[PDB]
Design a protein around this ligand. Structure first.
Ligand SMILES: C[N+](C)(C)CCOP(=O)(O)O
Length: 258
């Protein structure tokens, strides 16, 4: 299954902990806390709002949203191990729920959520399944609700080089252009579709993370090995190179139901 592939490779327990080291406590998404603050800076919610986080990871996004707004947050992630980790990070809070499930089969009521949020998770879905997911999101959103996404994107496939092809293949990502992604949202009937190519800002975030890794190498080596350091260091180096030249891109999408 896809679930097994993710839990046994990219998101093993150790893989997740290595990601958390560089992204920041409670995060496996780009830019950790600081990007979260920026991405939510123009979003309005309150204690009565209902939020779905698709690909909730270690839960930092939901923790932040609930802290900032007091909103009810429900995170779904297909990886059972990651959800177990997230659930160890929150207690005594009846407004934060993390659930291990496949978002493509999960049932939610129509007109349910004030915000559907997702951070660097939909890259795992095939193109067919991205379309299916966004159709479900449209239904699940309240008439007044907002969809807010960041995700890994890319230049057109014809332009990819050998190293980038191999990264995408090994990860089993489906990376499309920012423009194709926006077109899916438009085809699902979302309104006010705003897409931003945030590759430059992503490059900045990556540089901050890369510098952190380098400055904290000693501590990393005590927690994990030199082999894992090299892999992580080289992975960030390629992302920095490829975002600078817009081969690998970072897309931001915001849209509404009405
Ligand atoms: C995709 N993610 C942001 C959840 C984890 C990191 O993936 P990657 O940048 O190592 O490909």
């Amino acid at each position: 299954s896809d679930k097994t592939f993710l839990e046994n490779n990219q998101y093993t327990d150790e893989g997740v902990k290595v990601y958390e080291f560089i992204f920041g406590e409670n995060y496996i998404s780009s830019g950790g806390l600081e990007a979260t603050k920026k991405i939510l800076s123009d979003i309005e919610l309150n204690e009565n709002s209902k939020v779905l986080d698709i690909g909730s990871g270690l839960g930092g996004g939901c923790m932040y949203i609930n802290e900032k707004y007091g909103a009810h947050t429900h995170g779904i992630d297909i990886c059972s191990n990651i959800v177990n980790m997230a659930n160890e990070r929150v207690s005594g809070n009846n407004k934060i729920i993390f659930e291990a499930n496949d978002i493509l089969t999960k049932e939610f009521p129509e007109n349910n959520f004030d915000l559907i949020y997702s951070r660097d998770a939909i890259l795992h879905l095939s193109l067919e399944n991205k379309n299916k997911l966004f159709q479900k999101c449209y239904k699940w959103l309240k008439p007044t609700g907002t969809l807010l996404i960041t995700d890994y994107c890319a230049t057109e496939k014809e332009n990819w080089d050998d190293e980038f092809k191999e990264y995408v293949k090994q990860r089993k990502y489906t990376l499309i252009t920012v423009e194709e992604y926006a077109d899916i949202l438009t085809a699902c009937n979302f309104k006010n579709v705003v897409s931003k190519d945030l590759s430059d800002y992503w490059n900045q975030l990556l540089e901050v993370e890369h510098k952190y890794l380098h400055e904290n190498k000693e501590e990393f080596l005590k927690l994990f090995s030199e082999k894992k350091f090299i892999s992580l260091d080289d992975g960030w180096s390629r992302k920095i190179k490829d975002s600078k030249r817009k081969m690998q891109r970072w897309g931001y999408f915001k849209a509404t139901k009405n």
